Each structure stands twice: as C-alpha cells, then as structure tokens.
Write a protein that binds this DNA or RNA. Structure first.
Lengths: 117, 119, 54, 211, 122
RNA sequence: GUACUCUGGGGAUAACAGGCUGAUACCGCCCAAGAGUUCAUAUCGACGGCGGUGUUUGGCACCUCGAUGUCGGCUCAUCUCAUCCUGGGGCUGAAGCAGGUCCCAAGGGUAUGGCUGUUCGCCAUUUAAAGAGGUACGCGAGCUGGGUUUAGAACGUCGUGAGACAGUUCGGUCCCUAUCUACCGUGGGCGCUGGAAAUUUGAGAGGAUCUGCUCCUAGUACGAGAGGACCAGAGUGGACGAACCUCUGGUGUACCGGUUGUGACGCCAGUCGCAUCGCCGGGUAGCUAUGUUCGGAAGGGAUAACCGCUGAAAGCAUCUAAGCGGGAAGCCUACCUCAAGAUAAGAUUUCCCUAGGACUUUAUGUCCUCUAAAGAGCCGUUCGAGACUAGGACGUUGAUAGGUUGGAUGUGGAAGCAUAGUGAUAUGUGAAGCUGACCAAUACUAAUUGCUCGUGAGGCUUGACU
RNA sequence: UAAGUUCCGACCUGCACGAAUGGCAUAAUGAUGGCGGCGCUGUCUCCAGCAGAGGCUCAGUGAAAUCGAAAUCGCUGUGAA
RNA sequence: CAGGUCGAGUAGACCAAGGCGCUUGAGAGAACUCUGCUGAAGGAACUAGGCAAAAUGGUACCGUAACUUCGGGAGAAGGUA
RNA sequence: GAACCCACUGUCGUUGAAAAGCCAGGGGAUGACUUGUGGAUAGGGGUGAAAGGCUAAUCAAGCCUGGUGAUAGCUGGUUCU
RNA sequence: GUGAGGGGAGUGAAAUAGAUCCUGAAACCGCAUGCAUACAAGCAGUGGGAGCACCUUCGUGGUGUGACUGCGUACCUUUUG
C-alpha cells in the first residue's frame, strides 16, 4: 500500500479472492489457459517455487522445473486470468526467501527437504 | 540527480558519519544543550528522537538495542531512567533547533540543540 | 591559453558591475528591545521570550 | 478543441478477460469551471477559459479575486485556455462545468505535460553521443564531445551545434493514446500507456488531432 | 538475444553439435535475434559420418534463449541454454528429430515440423 | 664523413598546406566510316574537332624558416550534385516480370567482419542501398601514436675507411588552469506613454521527413510455355527518436540476515570497532535499458521534367503567341516545441492610488509637511525544480519539513525463558524481531514579533463621439 | 579461418646465404620477436547505478605564461595571394 | 632494539608499551576528470597488439606427454579431502 | 619468497608533492652480491662487462680566471628643427 | 585590545617638516561635481553640428560635454611590394 488511495481502489476492484497459501520451496502445479483459434484448454506446469513477490495486484511468483534435461523458469502473475488454478503438492523447508542457488545445482544436489507438521 | 533521496554526506565516509552522529547524540543526552553546525543539528533529529521513542518502554531487549546503538552505559541508564518517563506522554518532537549566527573561524552557520523540557 | 591583448579598465569594471554586497534581514526583538538577526537567537540568549542561559 | 485539465496519479495495470495486461495511467479530474468566453468581436479569436482545483484566499490576489467573482466560480489552483470553433463553443456558458463525461471509452486522445527535469547533462545522455575507448592509451577523454568544427574554413562553430546543457523539464505532448476507463463516480480517466511528468503533475487531455 | 560470435547448441539430429552465429538476418544494422528469427551460422562441431560437416555455412532458426520471451499477460519464460535448428537454402527444417522443449512463437506455416516431432511442448 | 653535432642568417631558396596556371586528369558536346538479320543515331561508335571543372600527376616560387608542427584510426560534423536507394517521366531491338539509355529531383536514408600501420585493395556474409566529391587531401590548445623522420643494435648491398641506402628488422617522453570572436545552457539591468496580478494572438525560428516483407486484388491482364503485373487495400517488422517505471531485469556503501580473524564492553550470554561495504545471500524508494508505450498519418496550394484542351501567326498543322488544365519522397502550408528586446515592444479580464503649503527657473517646475495603496522582495519550512540562480508549494486562519501513530514492503523464525540431547544443535513461546527514501492521519518541534521597495489619478496636438 | 599482405610446412631463376666478421642444429633458460588455443572478463555491442576526491557556493590567504592600442559580429568579394 | 593471538616467518589482519589525527575550513551532492564496487544477454565481435581489467593462488595425497646434455621438462597438464 | 638492490608494463602527474616521482603489478635476492668509513686515478687526460657512457642537476673534449672590447662580407638599433 | 592607527592640545618660521620625515613628477588606483550613454557594428580620430551645465564685459563671448553626420584599415624595420 505505497500507492495513492485512488490507485489502491482501482487495483482492489480486480483482486482474486481464492488463492491458496504457498511459500518458496513448495512444489506447485499451475493450470495455464491455452487459447488457439476457438479451442481453449488447460495445460499443466509443475515445479518448485523459487521466488515470491507480494505487491497486491502486482504479485508474481517464479516456478522452475526440468523438462527433458533442459531447465525452464516461468514468472507467473498471480492475479492474471490466464492462471486458472494453483495446487500445492508438497511443502518444502528452506532457510531463505529466494532460492536462486538452485540454478547451479542439478540432480541429487538440488533436492528440497520436506516441511513436517 | 537525487530525486526523493534522504540522508546527508557532510564530506565523510559512512562509518565516520555514523560514529560522529553517535557521539553527538551522547553529548546531547549528557548535557541537554549543545551548539553545532546547522546541517548537523537538523540531521541529528532523525538519529536522536528514535532513541527516546525506544527508551519509552523498559525491557531487556530494548536496553540491549539502545546499547547497540550508543555503546554508552551511562547514556543507556539516563535514557531509561530519566528521559523516557519524562517524555512518556509526548507525541514526538523532543528536540528544538534554533539558529545562532555564524562561526568566526570559517563563517559556518550554527545552531543550538535543546531538549524540550530541560530544566 | 592566454589573452592576446591586455584588458582595459572599462571592461574590467564592467565585469565587476555584479559584485555589490547586500544587507542582512534585521529586526527589533519585542521581548528585549535589541536589534537581532531575523529568525535567530540574540547574542544574550533570547528568542521569542524564552531564554536559553540562566 | 475542448479538453480537460487533470492531475497525474500514477501507473497501474488492467487485466482483460482474455488475460492481457494493459499498462495504464490514472488521471484524477476535479470538474473544470468555465471562467471566461472569448469571441471574435472582443478578442479576435474563440477560446474557452477554465479553472480547476482549490486555492486559499490568502494566496489569491485581489485582481484574481475580482476576475473569479465576475464569473461566479471558486478560485482554482490554475487557469487554462482551449481554442475552439463555433460548434464546440455552442452549449457552453460562463459558470458552467466540464466533466469526465466529455470522453468515451475507446476514444483516441493526446496528453500534454511537463517532463521530469534532469539538470545539467552531457552529450552522451542528452544527444546519444558515443564514448571513446576506455583503455588503449586514452587520456582523460572518455565522455567528452570530441571535435566541434572544421578548420580555418569556416573558422567558427555553427548554430544549433549539439553540446552540453539543461535537459528535461519541458512541455511534451504524446499522441495516439486510448481511453481505457471513464469513472464518473470517482472523476477519473484511465488511459493506456505512459504520459509525461511526475506523479502529482498537471496534465492536459484533448481529442486527437491526427484525424 | 543472440548476436554475432554467439555459440549455440543444436536441438536436432542433422549432425551438428555446436554452431556459431556469424550474421543476424532481416535488416541493415540489425543487432539481436530472438526465438523465431533466422540467422547464418558456421558449424564448429559435428558427429562424424553425417550430412553436415565442420566449416559449413548454413541457415538456422533460434528456438531457445537464456534471455527469455515475454507473453501478453506480462510473464517471461527463460531457458537454461541457447539452441537452434538447422535449415536448408529454402529455409525449411532438414532434421528428423528434435531435442528439448520449444516455444509457441513457431506456430507459423514455416515451422510446423519441429513441433510435430517435438516430444514436450509448454 | 657527421643520424653525436653546433653558431650566424634566409620565405632572397626546397619539403606540407594556400595562391596563379590547366599541359595532364575527370566530365560534357559536334561530325560521323561502321557494328547492330535490313536500319549511323534502341544501344555502341573509328578518323578528326570544341568546351567545362578545379577531386589527379605536374609547372611557377607570391605568403609563412625571431616555427602555419601529423600518414592512418577514433569522436563530432557541414555543404555540392556530375544521384547509390526510395519518388515522377520520354524512348526502347519496351508482350508480362525484368533490363538498357536519357530528363526532373538533394527530403530522408546510405553494412559488419578476416588480412595489412595503412588510405586503397582482395576475400566472407548481409542490405532497399552499401554514391562521387569540397571543407588546411574537415577535425591532434578534442583522444591515440601503429607508419614515416633523432640518438641503441643487426642482416643484404655500396665504400680502404669514418659512414651510407630504388632496402629490411627489434626498441624508442605527444606541454598549455580559455582573455576575445563563435557555440551550448542559465541569470542580472533597463525599456515597452501611471502602477499591478493573470490569460493570451503569432511576424518568425527550430525539430521531424527513411524503408523491408506477408496477405488481397489474382494465378487475373499478358504469354506457346515457363513465368507473371500496373492501379487500389490490410497486417506485421528493421533502423531512428521521444516520454515513462505498471510489467522483466541492473544498481541500490544510512534495510535484513549468514560467516572468518582479531580487540574491546568485568565474565557467560548478547553486541560493537577494524579487515575493499572484511567476505557472502537477498533487497524498499530513486535512477535506469536490455523493459513499456507512442511517432514519421491524412489533407490542402503553387510547381519541375512530362502529358494536354481550344487556337492563330503560317486557309493546313501546332500545348502558346490571347485564353484554360493535369503533374513528384522536392517548395509553402499541415504535425510538435520556442516565440512581442516583433524598440513595429501587440490583445483581453480584473485590481490600486482622488492631501495641504512656500517660492520662481511659470514649467509633466523645485523644495517642506502629511501619506505608503494594489503588489514585489528580504527572511523561514522546503521540492519529483536546481551548479549559483531561476521556477513551484507553504509560513499558525498551518500538513511545508522532521518526529509520532497506523499500514505496506523487505529479510526470514530476535532477545529472554522453557523443553530434548553428553555435546555441537533443535523445537515452542511466535512468521517473531527489526525494517533509509513509500501511503494515510496527527500541531509534538520548527515556519515569531517583522522590515525594505513600489505612491498621491498619470504631458501636449488633432479627430470622432458626447 | 566463413573469410589469413601475418604464422607453419615445402618448392628453389639465392635482385643480393655459406662455413671461427664462423655454417647447420640443439635440452634448459629469457620482464626477448611472431602466430594459434582453454579459462576469463565493461576491451567491446552499449553503457547503467552506487562510494570517495575535485568541480560549484560561502569565509580567509592569494599565483602564472601573455599583452602596440581597442567602441574585439555573419556572409560574398578585394587585397603582400 | 623490537611484545600478544593465529602463522614457516622480521610476510599478513587486529592489538600492547609507546606515539599520533599529518597548519585552511563550512556547505552543495550538476556536466566533466581521477580512484574504486557491482552489472541483464553475448564473450575479443575491441584494438597496431587481449593494452588494461577479469581470472589462478594453501597444505596433504594421487597422477603427470613430447623432448633430453639424463640433471631435467615438472608445481607439466589434471584430480580428491 | 620479506628486508635490501634494481627498473619491464600501465594509469596519474607535466606553471608537479617531485628540475625524473607516486600507485598497482614486475626482476635479483650466498653472489660476477649489497653497503659504511678512509684513500688512488684530472681534461685530448682519467675511468668504462663499451651506451661516446660517466668525470658535482654541465660532456664528440669539465669548471674558473686571463689573451679579450677574439673575429662576424650576417641580423638588429642609431635620439632636436 | 594598556596593540596598530588616528583626532584634539602643545613645540616650531613651517607638522600636507612627525620619525624610510627637503622637494614629491609619471605609470597605476580611489572619492566628488558637470555632460553624454541600454535599437546600435570596425585603428576610436578628423571636418561639420543641435542640445545641456557653469561663467559672463550679456556677445557674432569663454569653459566642459558631444546627440546626428561626410571621410578614414596603428607605429618601426625589411622589401618589387
């Protein structure tokens, strides 16, 4: 809430109201709308959350995964309508907010240990 | 450009500046009335007033934070036993800065820094 | 780089035509009656009635 | 044509139902009050003078106080003029009000403002000059202008030569912006893209001149 | 964001393994090539006994970049490598297999072959 | 012999650049044997002839030897047109697509690399295109110093030798704080027919001006086939430019944390100083590009080459002599910015000042007393404005700055205590603690009492209304 | 090498090599001359932000080379050109 | 002559005994210059030339080519804790 | 590889802090080594692991004083009507 | 400021003969009065010439200034120039 009240109201008009709670280190599945011609479908994107930005309507989060030996990162905008659903498969335990050190690790080295209740 | 930036330089390194302002705050809390240059006096508010705000509440953690910021046992004791109870009900503004002419040696503008209820 | 001709006294004075000094803002303090610099404490420690030194 | 005077409030985004993110600028508009109408018979051209905002009486001078009292409107923080023709001039009277309903969603407009001030700037920033090599024996000549002219012929520097000087803080107009939202409850215009100036600056919104 | 002297992996099996960009095509003074752009490459490393050999100068299309690509909602997708696919003189793919994921900016009539062969698409 | 050198002199006399000239160089024109199945003139054109320019190689020795100190590169340019691309045309041995040649046209645009000290050149891959020239072969008191041209050394060659070169090779000090003109920015003074606060017209000046590809017309016109359009419409790029920071990132030495060595705070615990911010991981505002958005659209008027209508001189013919048209990225407008020091100093709205004496130089006269307006400034709190200035906001009838309270963000589980462990450690209290510059409230602190400047109805002549 | 007036191998019509003004080689050594690679990078595409020292303003002290005299504009022409 | 903690050390960081803060200051936080730190994607495309910068760097152990005057080359290269 | 002795590269400095330096890198570092004190060699002479190098900030013939007011077919200057 | 420096008083023929003191020129630097000067381009003068201020024998006079205007590219040396 570092903006003017008018801007705050305009952005608050568009907020989503059904997000789940998730934190860096958790592995999530995101359903992304894919819209070709007049076919519409949901496509899955599963991976580890390495960064989270809390800025109201400007919130974003970064998901990293390995696809056939090639690493891929995507920065989703949390309140975008193209993001259909977020599902938290598993909760991870880490010691910091940004996990950029995972880019230089592969295989056994980049394992995240689980948060236990 | 320095659009919307805060803080001063005063021709010093950062650690030298921090040490100088700590010394000034300690002298002010000891004597209750000091004379210095006008830019130093105006910047001293942002360093000295939060110490009183912190000393309003007396706990072990608050005393250790005050000692971390001042490194003076006598200053910590006076803050937590005299100044904080004195200013418990005042909403900020514990200092007053008054223009006091110029300095003979180099014509630098000068100011008095005073605690609000000194004596 | 240096002048090819000496500069005349007329041009020298024309350059100095912007060097005049200016008076300060002085005001008679009502509490004590003495002339003091505006927005400043007087020489004996008075400002808006309150006194600094016992 | 007839336009509006408003204040820049900041940037944000709008999400479309397809999911596209549109960057937008918010302009807050206090309804403009007409103070004077200028005509051919008395002034020699046709314009509408408006005021907006608020100003305290201790800061309003006596001449301006009389000028506002003649029209019967409250003193504003600024006064502006819009050049108009007969058709646009029809319908407007001294003491009337112009609001955000002057514009419609989807309309193309031009926005004028005062750009941010950068101060004294050099050739590299002000004119996109290229720097000289950082190494290979260079002697204190990394961001300098270089050559500024020819030899004995013509033996001078031409007018308009690009040099160092003040940059920014000028009147700038951006054309071809689209109106995204017209909020009458809040008296707000939401336009697509960036507009000149800083937050809190005064801006002018007019219908597009390119067709 | 590919320029000259940039080395790229080959995301196919035409024979090359590493290629070097020597020209960005499509305009005077054009600096960078992104996903979906045509470049001229020289072959630096190749599997022995294959159609392509070292020192060949060919056309290629960029399919993966480390700099990334923006999407209409404001997102960005980044990959861990820079990769390309070799083309012929008519700017058509010549490979019979493709390695690794790719992007939707290739949905042009020129580039159906790579997606049709590709295993993984996001 | 002197390149290990020295003194007195010369622009009386050479090398660079300027000057005069134009043999030479480049460009244009006249005649036309002929070539072109025939047909000099679609396109070339022998033997000869006449000019233009001042980019070449030269001639002279007028300026400079009490110094005009540079081969190429870098940075920054400005002009010409004998035009490289884009625009408009005539002819063609012009079917179409292309091409050739000539005329008009200077608005904009007009490669990256390998080799070499190179300019040049060759080569690779692009582009719509990679034009020719002048500006001290533009630019070294703006940078460099690889080549040439000091002193060291070597090879080939010449000389008995000191030494030398239609040669080669390794190494080898680039000074100057800007007075005047010019230029880029930013102020002070006075003027503008009494003074003041604002809003303005535009004589004029500057900026901008580029272009590819795909679809469609239409596989249509044309053509044996292969190939394949003019005109007229959409879309999407390259380069260039401007504004901005919502998004993606960079920085973020006054924000948070981990950790090594050492010293100290009496000691444990907890902290701080120093070691490049000690090192390392993140990161708020602000600034910023590689990020985002926008621009070169459309339309008028006069024309260039060229094409006309009607029409005589000259009963025909003829775009011209009378008269009437079309015609280009070029010109004037049009778009953006500046603009009345435009001394020709413009216009509109509103506001302010309506007192007495003495005298003579009897005049918008000079001196006394009273008066001090509308406003401006000094000063203070300051700014997304700034070198100093200038500009914007506010000064108690107040949110201008700091502080305080709340929120937001970032970091990531504070100290103390208690549990489980022999211990390093872990868990709970509790997503806690701390949080520069951000948002919103709030007179707690500082914007005090003030002073200076600016006056007292604004000459005369003529004219029209009163 | 995509592209090599430099580099390496070989050829030999050696303008004008050649045997103690030594000829041809040679392990090790060289702040020695030429060429090519890996790693690495603001050298560069193309620069951005930040820290310190100057620059700028105020108070104090206070130089320099130069200099016939100056009321010291543009253009085209003339003229020790 | 020359102490303490680490250390092979009289190297290095921080300290002891003992000495000092270097004879103009105060503000501001523009261009440009000097000295530093970090930098997206690319990685010599720069340039006469990788100039400058960036990078490597300790102890123990394993391993180590051509060539050789048999000494070397060699800490070759490379790797683990 | 420190002290010590040198001087290969670059930036800065060039009316400098300095009439040859600072900073970051660099070479030798038990030897043909570095260094203190006191002596010897004197100008067509000395000394030189040799650059015409050095011989008191001076070297293809040191400095000082005399011959001496050297000579100059050269340059400059030459005063009231 | 028990300073430096000065103002009175006093000495002396004279103190603007007052101590680096006879006379006290020029370059150079101030203050005061009169006139001119902020729309106009250049060796700064010269030949004309309105207005203003003071003096005055009141003038066909004297002193200072100089709006506007015609003409006008320093001196010396050395040279064909």
């Amino acid at each position: 809430s570092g903006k003017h009240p008018l801007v705050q109201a305009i952005e608050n008009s568009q907020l989503k109201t059904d997000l789940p709670e998730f934190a860096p280190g958790d592995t999530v599945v995101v359903q992304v709308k894919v819209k070709e011609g007049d076919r519409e479908r949901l496509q899955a994107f599963e991976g580890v959350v390495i960064a989270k930005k809390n800025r109201g309507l400007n919130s974003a989060f970064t998901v990293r995964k390995i696809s056939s030996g090639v690493g891929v990162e995507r920065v989703f905008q949390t309140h975008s309508p193209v993001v259909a659903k977020i599902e938290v498969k598993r909760r991870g335990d880490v010691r910091r907010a940004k996990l950029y050190y995972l880019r230089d690790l592969s295989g056994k080295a980049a394992r995240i240990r689980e948060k236990l209740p | 450009m320095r659009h919307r930036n805060s803080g001063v330089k005063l021709g010093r390194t950062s650690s030298h500046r921090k040490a100088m302002f700590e010394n000034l705050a300690n002298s002010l809390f000891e004597h209750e009335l000091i004379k210095t240059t006008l830019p130093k006096a105006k910047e001293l508010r942002r360093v000295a007033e939060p110490l009183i705000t912190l000393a309003k509440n007396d706990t072990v953690a608050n005393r250790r934070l005050a000692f971390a910021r001042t490194r003076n046992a006598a200053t910590v004791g006076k803050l937590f036993t005299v100044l904080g109870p004195r200013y418990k009900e005042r909403n900020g503004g514990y200092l007053r800065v008054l223009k006091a002419g110029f300095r003979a040696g180099d014509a630098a503008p000068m100011a008095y820094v005073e605690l609000v209820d000194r004596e | 780089a240096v002048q090819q001709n000496r500069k005349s006294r007329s041009r020298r004075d024309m350059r100095r035509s912007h060097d005049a000094l200016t008076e300060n803002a002085l005001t008679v303090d009502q509490a004590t009656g003495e002339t003091h610099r505006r927005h400043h404490v007087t020489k004996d420690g008075f400002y808006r009635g309150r006194q600094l030194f016992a | 044509a007839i336009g509006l005077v408003g204040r820049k409030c900041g940037m944000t985004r709008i999400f479309t139902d397809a999911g596209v993110s549109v960057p937008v600028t918010v302009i807050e508009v206090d309804p403009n009050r007409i103070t004077q109408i200028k005509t051919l018979e008395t002034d020699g051209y046709q314009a509408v003078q408006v005021t907006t905002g608020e100003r305290r009486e201790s800061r309003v001078t006596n001449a301006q106080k009389g000028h506002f009292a003649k029209a019967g409107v409250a003193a504003g923080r600024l006064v502006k003029e819009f050049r108009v023709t007969e058709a646009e001039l029809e319908g407007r009277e001294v003491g009337g009000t112009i609001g955000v309903d002057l514009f419609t969603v989807g309309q193309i407009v031009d926005v004028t403002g005062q750009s941010k001030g950068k101060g004294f700037q050099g050739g590299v920033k002000r004119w996109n000059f290229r720097t000289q090599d950082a190494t290979h024996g260079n002697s204190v000549s990394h961001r300098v202008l270089g050559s500024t002219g020819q030899n004995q012929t013509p033996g001078r520097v031409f007018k308009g030569k690009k040099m160092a000087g003040h940059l920014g803080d000028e009147r700038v107009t951006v054309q071809g912006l689209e109106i995204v939202s017209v909020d009458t409850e809040r008296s707000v215009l939401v336009v697509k893209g960036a507009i000149p100036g800083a937050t809190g600056g005064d801006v002018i919104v007019r219908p597009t001149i390119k067709a | 964001m590919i320029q000259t002297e940039t080395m790229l992996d080959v995301a196919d099996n035409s024979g090359a393994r590493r290629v070097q960009c020597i020209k960005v095509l499509g305009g005077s003074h054009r600096r960078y090539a992104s996903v979906g752009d045509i470049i001229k490459v020289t072959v630096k490393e190749a599997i022995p006994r294959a159609r392509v050999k070292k020192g060949d100068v060919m056309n290629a299309v960029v399919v993966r970049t480390k700099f990334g690509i923006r999407r209409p909602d404001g997102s960005v997708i980044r990959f861990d490598d820079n990769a390309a696919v070799i083309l012929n003189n008519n700017k058509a793919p010549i490979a019979t297999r493709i390695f690794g994921p790719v992007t939707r900016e290739l949905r042009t009539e020129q580039f159906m072959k790579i997606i049709s062969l590709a295993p993984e698409v996001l």
